[PDB]
Design a protein around this ligand. Structure first.
Ligand SMILES: CNc1nc2ccc(NC(C)=O)cc2s1
Ligand SMILES: CNc1nc2ccc(NC(C)=O)cc2s1
Ligand SMILES: CNc1nc2ccc(NC(C)=O)cc2s1
Ligand SMILES: CNc1nc2ccc(NC(C)=O)cc2s1
Lengths: 330, 327, 330, 330
């Protein structure tokens, strides 16, 4: 054989991937996660799982054909979860998505049913994985993943408000003429209608914008900064209305979270976690708060100081989400 | 104003602007890969479907926190493309299941009659990167319509075909594609030419280890690797309905050589009149040095009698189509 | 020629670089700036200039030999400033540097005299450039480079406290178990002994550490956070005491500023610019305050809200700098 | 405590890194390897070891102070090898270095002695690491580390001719007006004076320069391409004369090798390995041939077809190294 003429093999294999990531679902969100992760060099192996064989194989092939331009030497796919074995991070994007005028919360019974199959099959083959949930309603489905998997809370993460805050910071940037990296501000709570802009923390160079205008984000605000939060809440729906779905931004947001996990960075992200014990919340609610993210998932939670109004808005989001949790049928 | 309370302003054009024409799957794959390789300080998108266009723009803009391209704009109106260093054309009818890219030619020539003069109007000194199919004929057309000197009119050509060939060779050999070397030239399509004479790892000619390499007499039928290269788009189209990611990555690799003036060699579409035994204004892929002025030099690959035959055949097939077309 | 057999030239070769950077000085600082810039792919041409013929050629050669691993296709050097033609960014690292036990301010007479030569030669060949001053005392020398150059003040930028703030954020993250990217805090004023830690802006996820612990950074602070700023002031002197000089941190700091300039990012950095008009300051003092940095340099200045003590401290830094700058002749 | 007021901790972590790299030796070569590996985001922990305590701690601090600009969250140093525990890759750059005019082979007994201390300490704390030898003479010192470590030969790699081949490709590029990435050519054998340029493999776009010019690299060569290989052999001496040492190109070369290993790329590099059984070599000689390099080190060797003259040169290189190697006191 030509190969053996050209190459002397010196070593019996033992290929056990060291930085493997799995993306479950090859819809537009999942493939946006994939290309973003590939282009950030975060993994030595990428596996894709879905239920439509042809679509899955074609997406796998299309990525493989770009390998020259990449640094991820093994891209694989199967309907069978054994392909995901030894993943450090498994990203769940499968399930029904919201239509125009439909709340993400309306997706819950359909995606719970799907999760009942996906989660046990995922955790089966990857004892070291973190589970990053992207499917919606993301906060409820992170709770669901946690309950079905039996994983400890640090290992079950929801993409949560990482995108909402990125959007908030983009829109703020545009108003001030400053790059979003230098515009700081947190949208917490539900990834959806009841999210909470934390005006008290919104700043450039440590300068509190609320300190300069204490009516920031209220109806009295002459510059109507609340509209920036409204734009954040409406963003997914506006993009859905224009191009049919969203993909690129969530892909990049998920890639940003993957980077923190895979590279043990311990950056702070507003992502879905259990918050029993904070802000007077006494039940097992999952919602976005600022969490320190690394190789063991969420190891630490930042206790954001909230005004009485912000705290009320967060408890409100927490009641909403708990109310849907009480509808869950395991 | 809050802004004025916060910031003292002291000072009232982009220098590395890229435009992508067409926000179909190819176009948007180009856009995401360009954004993720930090090649541009402004990205403009142009298409004719207003809602689709604005939505893709917005979806990109929402990821800005995670990118280093501070201005992302879109419009149907080509004034948005002004001052582009590079303009990438991906628009037009796209390859369909079970059909040659050559089936798309007249309709795309018609559309280029509109797009190209509008691009030239707002960026008279850009480099044009044609991706639309059939890319070899459309690169020629772009050149004729624009009036640009030929160095500034480049087709994505066989960059991707060669990438696919090096992936497949790497999979056979257990080696990364970066370390597997080999060229697919000619048409970006069914008449492409694998230059077996050049295929090598670490400077070791595979033909030296297997003289029949790529012929019918090759006991390990490496010709099938080229067959896989030719069929690849057809199979991917059959499976997922179009191709996007590999071509976006390929186009971004080329944008990088242009924007960074790398002078790397790529098998990309250029006018081959008076080279490799060819007499008409045919564009096809040969290895070209690519940089800030586009294509400045061509590598004269030493072709076997056959490889030269296949290459002249690929040229004939294309000039066959190009001949009998109206513009 | 083999070249002509191999290659047909189709185009006359009128090369003019589009993203050229020059580094003046190939001491440890300049070469650290060089390698960091080269590894962030910010330039299509790198020019080096110094006065020691052999050292310059050797440094250039060593970089050139790495070209396969880089994406900067032309690296050149010369004593003659014609080598620097057409630069978009020129970085000045040349001049005397402080010994152990010597103030950066003690370098000023030597480095003013050298700037009288360097600055007109840079401007002669790079009429479109921004000037990034790194040579010390950086605040006074930015003022000097501005005066000599005839450039507008937006295009004459001092590396300032970009490094001091990076040190502060590193030390803070170390204490808190958080990546520096998520620890926010500004050190302003002189890049030197009179710098000001802005405790009122120090935060994680928008949470003010001073609201948590009002004594933050005072002598009554039970965790002695003032020790963090003292480590920042002393950093250069400690590293100089240990390895003889500093290089890697300042190289990375300068590369960070080069990125914002070359990619027109409009990030906010604490860098040296004129502050006449703010904080009661009447004279042409240059010091660090947070500025928006982009392709035309510093286009905007953020007005940080300072406590009375912080502001008094910033005004004293200005006074210190004016004390030396008022005596300069050039 | 302020940390606890700010942050709630969820779990006591496994603080064991997944992608740890250690650099032994913090002279110019070691620190250029360090800055390059930092800027390529290859590791989640960088450990430095050397024997001079002050210089060691100064270099650690200087790197540490740039953390904000990096994605390597822990940088540590110690003269104690406990600091290196759980390294995936340990890069040995320590020992005496070429003075001006000095042959790398002249360093051999000094560096074998240093290695009798270094290697067992490294192996104690990372029994599963790959070893990357950079110290000179690198071929013989790779043999020494292999013998002392007791590792299987796949896990003991010498940086070899990776740099010599990068230099060759740089020079060919500047001759042809092509980027080094698109110029191909292999320099094999000893990293030093007896290296062998393989003229038969020298190509652009698969076009053999020898096919164009049948006298390429020979005494008859109109254009004296052999000068190009002479320049490769002479490069380190020239740079040492000019700047006193070499650092940047070797830093970049070592980082490129680290990348292949750490990301399991399975690229081919001309690096130091045992070539017993090739080219009629009957003894445990280490020298550079093209090797497939990945997460288990050197898994495969490409068999280059050499002319009789090229093979004779290569066996000459083999004999030279074996003369010294075969009599080592250890
Ligand atoms: C077990 N049921 C399902 N598994 C999966 C896995 C992936 C996907 N994909 C999408 C895009 O929703 C859908 C389903 S439905
Ligand atoms: C007739 N003019 C046209 N311009 C454009 C510009 C972009 C596109 N988009 C695609 C993907 O075909 C289609 C057209 S048709
Ligand atoms: C008097 N002019 C001078 N120009 C330069 C340019 C560079 C340097 N080098 C350093 C490292 O200070 C020193 C001088 S002195
Ligand atoms: C006692 N053995 C030694 N270990 C080491 C470790 C590092 C270095 N460093 C250099 C610069 O040679 C030298 C030695 S000598």
């Amino acid at each position: 054989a030509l190969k053996d003429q050209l190459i002397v093999n010196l070593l019996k294999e033992e290929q056990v991937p060291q930085n493997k990531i799995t993306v479950v679902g090859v819809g537009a969100v999942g493939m946006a996660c994939a290309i973003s992760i590939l282009m950030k060099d975060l993994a030595d192996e990428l596996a894709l799982v879905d239920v439509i064989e042809d679509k899955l194989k074609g997406e796998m092939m299309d990525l493989q054909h770009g390998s020259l331009f990449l640094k991820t030497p093994k891209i694989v796919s199967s309907k069978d979860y054994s392909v995901t074995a030894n993943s450090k991070l498994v990203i769940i994007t499968a399930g029904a998505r919201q239509q125009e005028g439909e709340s993400r919360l309306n997706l819950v019974q359909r995606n719970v049913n799907i999760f009942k199959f996906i989660i046990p099959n995922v955790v089966k083959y990857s004892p070291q994985c973190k589970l990053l949930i992207v499917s919606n309603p993301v906060d409820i489905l992170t709770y669901v993943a946690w309950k079905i998997s039996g994983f400890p809370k640090n290992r079950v993460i929801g993409s949560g408000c990482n995108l909402d805050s990125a959007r908030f910071r983009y829109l703020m940037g545009e108003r001030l003429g400053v790059h979003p990296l230098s515009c700081h501000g947190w949208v917490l709570g539900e990834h959806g209608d009841s999210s909470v802009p934390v005006w008290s923390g919104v700043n450039v160079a440590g300068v509190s914008l609320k300190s300069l205008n204490p009516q920031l984000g209220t109806d009295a605000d002459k510059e109507q900064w609340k509209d920036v939060h409204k734009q954040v809440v409406d963003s997914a729906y506006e993009v859905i209305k224009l191009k049919g779905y969203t993909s690129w931004a969530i892909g990049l947001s998920v890639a940003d979270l993957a980077e923190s996990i895979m590279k043990n960075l311990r950056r702070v992200h507003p992502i879905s976690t259990m918050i029993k014990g904070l802000y007077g919340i006494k039940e097992d609610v999952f919602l976005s708060v600022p969490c320190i993210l690394g190789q063991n998932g969420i190891s630490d939670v930042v206790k954001v100081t909230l005004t009485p109004d912000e705290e009320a808005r967060l408890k409100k989001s927490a009641d909403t989400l708990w109310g849907i949790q009480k509808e869950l049928q395991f």
